Structure 1
Amino acid sequence: PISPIETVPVKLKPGMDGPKVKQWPLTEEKIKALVEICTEMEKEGKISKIGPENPYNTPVFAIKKKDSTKWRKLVDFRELNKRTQDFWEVQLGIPHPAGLKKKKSVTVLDVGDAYFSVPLDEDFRKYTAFTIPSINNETPGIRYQYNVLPQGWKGSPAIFQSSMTKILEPFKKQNPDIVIYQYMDDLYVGSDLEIGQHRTKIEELRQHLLRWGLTTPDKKHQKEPPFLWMGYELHPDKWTVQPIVLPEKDSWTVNDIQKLVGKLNWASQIYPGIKVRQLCKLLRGTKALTEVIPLTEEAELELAENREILKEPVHGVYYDPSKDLIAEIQKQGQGQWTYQIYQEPFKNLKTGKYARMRGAHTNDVKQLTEAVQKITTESIVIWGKTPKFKLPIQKETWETWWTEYWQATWIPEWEFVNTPPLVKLWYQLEKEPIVGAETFYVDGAANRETKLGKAGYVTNKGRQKVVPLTNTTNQKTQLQAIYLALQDSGLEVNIVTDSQYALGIIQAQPDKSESELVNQIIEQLIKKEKVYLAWVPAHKGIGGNEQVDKLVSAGI
């Protein structure tokens, strides 16, 4: 039944008119079924047959030819959606099983006439017009428009959630011990009541909703064994996500793919590594929900990697507000980190992996910091507080790093956990120039016009080198010069540049970079026993710098 609740006013974006997209014809077996499904819908108030004065149209389709799946109609609102106003999505993110507290008695109610029993803003219905295809042309097709929140329309979820909140509000006040969570058509109700009274408070809720227009069938059916909330299995002492199965086939429609991305977004919340970039590609640029879009090579590869991940189940425990959260991180091999959040040893709430990179040049200690920050924020989202950290970094390592970093850094309450490969600063810059180490004054230049450059050095001991370079830049030549000096020197060396660029990069003790050059500089830096790097203004006297400049700039 359609709910008595007040509609929410809905607007088109300013300057935009309504949809005016035309119907595709077809099989007069699709037209049957459509007309059946439609008359049924019309019987229940969801839609009304209308008058041809209405100028707007959006397409209709018929899907799942039998297959033990009778038929089902399919409205393509893509065009209307782009024309309807934006909405504020209130939710910061979707709820996680580990965020749930332990409850003696739990029920999940289903909202079937979810969308199809919440009224649409009267003024807005005219824009949801569609036609069922006119077989022959002495008259047009059957016209209709929606009276409730349409399936794929941009506003249904926001408005549906809004409405569920107004409707549940009375019943919550009357019942402050009971917690209710709405998610799509799942309604989670938990309490610590005895199964006798709890089941009883539920019947009351079912009536409450019923008064407001919302049905809720004698649940039983034949799905009662496991107990599912938004795809999670909620057992008494733990939750589980059963392995997800992605369809296999080759003929993939726009609709098939739109469905796939959704089911992958739900999933990336529980599993680490789920990717959707290639699949989303296949979509925009086209039309026709039912047109077959063949999978690119990359897309095919994303799907393979996605199955491999979604291959295993996931398990976790519930949250106990009376216990600290602990989070533990391990290094996993070049930009790879794993973490476990728990409250009691070995009973995990949530586990994940961070695989990323800072910018172009980074180090394990920066990465660990960002990982700590990413985890802090997740924790606040899911539990509203921050975990105590256990990190594979010695206090002294962190102590010397944050002491000397030109940027402010911080890490919350933490303790050292001597575990996998510990997190280390791979080399250090010397504070003071080194006695009896040779001094290389390096320099580099390159013609912006021609791309040709030279990189080389000059040392206090009469040593020298100049190297001709094709297609590089002022900035690369500077780096090449420094490398030269690293190559051609002993375990101790004082280098001197006038390159702000170069000096900055080395200053931050990168142990990893996306520049081949820089990575070779690193491997050099780690061999050396003592390095001292030094900046000076270019184009000044500076006896050292002056010469290297002359030599390195015969590229004018």
Structure 2
Amino acid sequence: MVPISPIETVPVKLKPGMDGPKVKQWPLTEEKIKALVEICTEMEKEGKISKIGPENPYNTPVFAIKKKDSTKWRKLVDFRELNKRTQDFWEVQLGIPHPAGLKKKKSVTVLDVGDAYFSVPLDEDFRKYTAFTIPSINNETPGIRYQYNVLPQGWKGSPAIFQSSMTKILEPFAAQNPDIVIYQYMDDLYVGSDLEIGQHRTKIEELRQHLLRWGLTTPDKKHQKEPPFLWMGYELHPDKWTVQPIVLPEKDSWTVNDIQKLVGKLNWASQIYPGIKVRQLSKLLRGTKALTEVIPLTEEAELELAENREILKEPVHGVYYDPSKDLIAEIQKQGQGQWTYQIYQEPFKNLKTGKYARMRGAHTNDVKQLTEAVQKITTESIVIWGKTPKFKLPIQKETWETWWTEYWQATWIPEWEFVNTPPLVKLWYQLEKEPIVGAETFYVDGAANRETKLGKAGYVTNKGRQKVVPLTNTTNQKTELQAIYLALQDSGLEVNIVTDSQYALGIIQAQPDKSESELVNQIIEQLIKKEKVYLAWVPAHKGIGGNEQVDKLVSA
């Protein structure tokens, strides 16, 4: 017999200050007891489990689920109470490899090692907590006691200990076979190479023997897959990849369910199908919190799904990654705070696509949203390909330059170039840095009564122009804004505006181009029509005759 190398044992402890599990074995029917002793007898003589004495006070319940179709019985141990008591393990499970990150390899094989997790030895000091009891027939003898000698399934540490052990074993094979690549995700082993199919299956054969050296049995006669394959909702083909073909549900009164199974499924399509939009269907969700409530479709929804039942019509595919070519990311504004993007290396052939939705914000503008989307694509690209893409953006170089040089915040987007595909991102207004000579000076103010919620807003100018408007159901902050709106509405193309509203300054200095407030949006629309606006701030209640002779006018 060719001798087996022992797999190193990972030391395991329970959580600090926690005993072991002591759960009672549930009453099983007589036929199910018969199956369990059959199963445990073979695995005991396989070295996988072993009978324990009456010493071990720990117990985990065991069930047997007759499998469907197959007239077989398979065993089930519910390790929920033991999992609660076992230490936390390291989390490599952070991400799922994205198909667009895989490099194109000529030959690729995948081998399921859902077998091998059970040939890995379990820490001896920890096997005492794996104990379980086969309940005897008529409960007239003591239930036969068992414990695990190897990684049990459904146990917390099994996936992490199995993959750690497997990585240890794969290291020297990969290191001494640089002409291959071996990825390892979940229960599968991905092996790819650029050599002819002949020398590939030989190196596949060599790997299986390498794993025999540690006592890990590998699928052989077929049973190991070759592309294509259906994997994690994708379709991986030798030259291309795509979402699994997955077709929209149909209802007349759409539930919560109905679109929770659809935006989450339209999100899936957006990673390869360009231009998928989701907003007019997600507003129908965050404003609700009942997992059966029904919502009628809004007027802009059946217009949007009519385009989601329009991009999902022809199969579009993604290419695999070529590390020798440049990475390009291109972004398009879609409207209503929606952004769509495509990442590619050659024209017409995307590696992947995607979307970005504005942050919930009180105010916003296009440049900040484009900047945010650039950062999202930057991080996504680092994850998938290990580098930042070169950007093509619907914003002019001089527009960006004026923006970042005058924006009060620090901002930066990596190397990029203008792509002239409307709608273009624009600066819709720009305040002046100095007062305007020969422009009328509007001293504005507003005030409201906290009790009656009545208020006034208006202005006085240097030419003697004046206005005060009475207002109902308004606040001090609203009247301060309304005062500015009136001055903008009533002035020429160039105007100086003096206010004491730190609230208004804070809004306008943030330079929004669209707002939740219908009032701020009117102000924005007036700013866009102007030629020059200089906005000055003065402290209130200093009697600065503008913000005095109009403070004594709006509170009268």
Q: Normalising by the residue count of structure 2, what TM-score does the alignment of the two structures yield?
A: 0.79
Equivalent pair of 2:270/2:354 in contact (CA under 8 Å): no
Question: In 2 relative to 1, CA 458–18 (structure 1 residues): closer, same or farther, beyond 3 Å?
Answer: farther
Question: In 2 relative to 1, CA 542–276 (structure 1 residues): closer, same or farther, beyond 3 Å?
Answer: closer
Three-state SS of the structure 2 residue aligned to 1:41 is helix
Equivalent pair of 2:4/2:213 in contact (CA under 8 Å): no
Provide the C-alpha distance between the structure 2 equivalents of 1:539 and 1:521, rounded to a whole number of angstroms. 25
Q: Residues 168-191 of structure 1: CA distance to partner in whole angstroms, max 9, x if unpaired?
A: 112123222221111112111122
Deviation at residue 351 of structure 1 after TM alignment: 1.4
Q: Decide which moves more: 298-307 or 5-14.
A: 298-307
Deviation at residue 413 of structure 1 after TM alignment: 2.1
Aligned equivalent of 1:175: 177
The answer on 1:409 being equivalent to 2:401 is no
Deviation at residue 199 of structure 1 after TM alignment: 1.4
Question: In 2 relative to 1, CA 17–321 (structure 1 residues): closer, same or farther, beyond 3 Å?
Answer: same
Deviation at residue 279 of structure 1 after TM alignment: 17
Equivalent pair of 1:243/1:312 in contact (CA under 8 Å): no
Three-state SS of the structure 1 residue aligned to 2:50 is strand
Q: Pick from 544, 547, 550 the counterpart of residue 545 of structure 1.
A: 547
Question: In 2 relative to 1, CA 333–258 (structure 1 residues): closer, same or farther, beyond 3 Å?
Answer: closer
Equivalent pair of 1:445/1:477 in contact (CA under 8 Å): yes
Equivalent pair of 1:23/1:58 in contact (CA under 8 Å): yes
Deviation at residue 396 of structure 1 after TM alignment: 1.7
Deviation at residue 264 of structure 1 after TM alignment: 12
Equivalent pair of 1:25/1:134 in contact (CA under 8 Å): no
Question: In 2 relative to 1, CA 229–252 (structure 1 residues): closer, same or farther, beyond 3 Å?
Answer: same
Equivalent pair of 2:333/2:423 in contact (CA under 8 Å): yes
Equivalent pair of 2:111/2:225 in contact (CA under 8 Å): no
Provide the C-alpha distance between the structure 1 equivalents of 2:286 and 2:153, rounded to a whole number of angstroms. 20
Question: In 2 relative to 1, CA 521–156 (structure 1 residues): closer, same or farther, beyond 3 Å?
Answer: farther
Q: Decide which moves more: 424-433 or 275-284.
A: 275-284
Deviation at residue 6 of structure 1 after TM alignment: 1.4
Provide the C-alpha distance between the structure 2 equivalents of 1:215 and 1:63, rounded to a whole number of angstroms. 25
Question: In 2 relative to 1, CA 210–314 (structure 1 residues): closer, same or farther, beyond 3 Å?
Answer: farther
Deviation at residue 505 of structure 1 after TM alignment: 1.8
**What does 1:132-211 correspond to in 2, within 5 Å?**
143-211=145-213
Equivalent pair of 1:2/1:148 in contact (CA under 8 Å): no
**What does 1:459-498 correspond to in 2, within 5 Å?**
459-462=461-464, 464=466, 474-489=476-491, 491-498=493-500
Aligned equivalent of 1:285: 287
Three-state SS of the structure 1 residue aligned to 2:512 is coil
Question: In 2 relative to 1, CA 292–45 (structure 1 residues): closer, same or farther, beyond 3 Å?
Answer: farther
Matched length:
554
Q: Decide which moves more: 313-322 or 260-269.
A: 260-269
Structure 2: 5+ residue runs without aligned partners? none
Q: Residues 303-333 of structure 1: CA distance to partner in whole angstroms, max 9, x if unpaired?
A: 9999999998662222222211111111112
Q: Residues 211-245 of structure 1: CA distance to partner in whole angstroms, max 9, x if unpaired?
A: 21211122414965734666655444333443358
Equivalent pair of 1:511/1:522 in contact (CA under 8 Å): yes
Equivalent pair of 2:325/2:345 in contact (CA under 8 Å): yes
Question: In 2 relative to 1, CA 160–432 (structure 1 residues): closer, same or farther, beyond 3 Å?
Answer: same
Aligned equivalent of 2:448: 446
Provide the C-alpha distance between the structure 1 equivalents of 2:206 and 2:166, rounded to a whole number of angstroms. 16
Equivalent pair of 2:79/2:154 in contact (CA under 8 Å): yes
Deviation at residue 110 of structure 1 after TM alignment: 1.7
Equivalent pair of 2:263/2:281 in contact (CA under 8 Å): yes
Equivalent pair of 2:101/2:385 in contact (CA under 8 Å): yes
Question: In 2 relative to 1, CA 148–538 (structure 1 residues): closer, same or farther, beyond 3 Å?
Answer: farther
Question: In 2 relative to 1, CA 529–370 (structure 1 residues): closer, same or farther, beyond 3 Å?
Answer: same
Q: Residues 449-498 of structure 1: CA distance to partner in whole angstroms, max 9, x if unpaired?
A: 88776554444455555566677654444334433444555554432222
Three-state SS of the structure 2 residue aligned to 1:283 is helix
Question: In 2 relative to 1, CA 528–41 (structure 1 residues): closer, same or farther, beyond 3 Å?
Answer: farther
Equivalent pair of 2:227/2:236 in contact (CA under 8 Å): no
Question: In 2 relative to 1, CA 349–552 (structure 1 residues): closer, same or farther, beyond 3 Å?
Answer: same
Aligned equivalent of 2:395: 393
Cα RMSD for the two superposed structures: 6.1
Q: Residues 79-112 of structure 1: CA distance to partner in whole angstroms, max 9, x if unpaired?
A: 4444433333246633222222222322222212
Q: Decide which moves more: 241-250 or 322-331.
A: 241-250
Equivalent pair of 1:112/1:215 in contact (CA under 8 Å): no
Deviation at residue 334 of structure 1 after TM alignment: 1.9
Equivalent pair of 2:270/2:355 in contact (CA under 8 Å): no
Provide the C-alpha distance between the structure 2 equivalents of 1:80 and 1:95, rounded to a whole number of angstroms. 30
Question: In 2 relative to 1, CA 247–68 (structure 1 residues): closer, same or farther, beyond 3 Å?
Answer: farther
Q: Residues 181-216 of structure 1: CA distance to partner in whole angstroms, max 9, x if unpaired?
A: 111121111222232222112111101111212111
Three-state SS of the structure 2 residue aligned to 1:315 is coil
Three-state SS of the structure 1 residue aligned to 2:206 is helix
Provide the C-alpha distance between the structure 1 equivalents of 2:426 and 2:368, rounded to a whole number of angstroms. 11
Q: Residues 49-99 of structure 1: CA distance to partner in whole angstroms, max 9, x if unpaired?
A: 444544444555555862569665555444444443333324663322222
Question: In 2 relative to 1, CA 102–490 (structure 1 residues): closer, same or farther, beyond 3 Å?
Answer: same
Question: In 2 relative to 1, CA 223–169 (structure 1 residues): closer, same or farther, beyond 3 Å?
Answer: closer
Deviation at residue 166 of structure 1 after TM alignment: 0.6
Aligned equivalent of 1:345: 347
Equivalent pair of 1:242/1:313 in contact (CA under 8 Å): no
Q: Residues 390-433 of structure 1: CA distance to partner in whole angstroms, max 9, x if unpaired?
A: 11111121121112112222222222111131111222223333
Aligned equivalent of 2:64: 62
Question: In 2 relative to 1, CA 278–530 (structure 1 residues): closer, same or farther, beyond 3 Å?
Answer: closer
Three-state SS of the structure 2 residue aligned to 1:338 is strand
Provide the C-alpha distance between the structure 1 equivalents of 2:313 and 2:118, rounded to a whole number of angstroms. 35
Q: Normalising by the residue count of structure 1, what TM-score does the alignment of the two structures yield?
A: 0.79
Q: Decide which moves more: 294-303 or 428-437.
A: 294-303
Question: In 2 relative to 1, CA 385–287 (structure 1 residues): closer, same or farther, beyond 3 Å?
Answer: closer
Provide the C-alpha distance between the structure 2 equivalents of 1:43 and 1:387, rounded to a whole number of angstroms. 57
Q: Decide which moves more: 95-104 or 222-231.
A: 222-231
Aligned equivalent of 1:226: 228
Deviation at residue 380 of structure 1 after TM alignment: 2.0
Deviation at residue 113 of structure 1 after TM alignment: 1.4
Q: Decide which moves more: 435-444 or 255-264.
A: 255-264
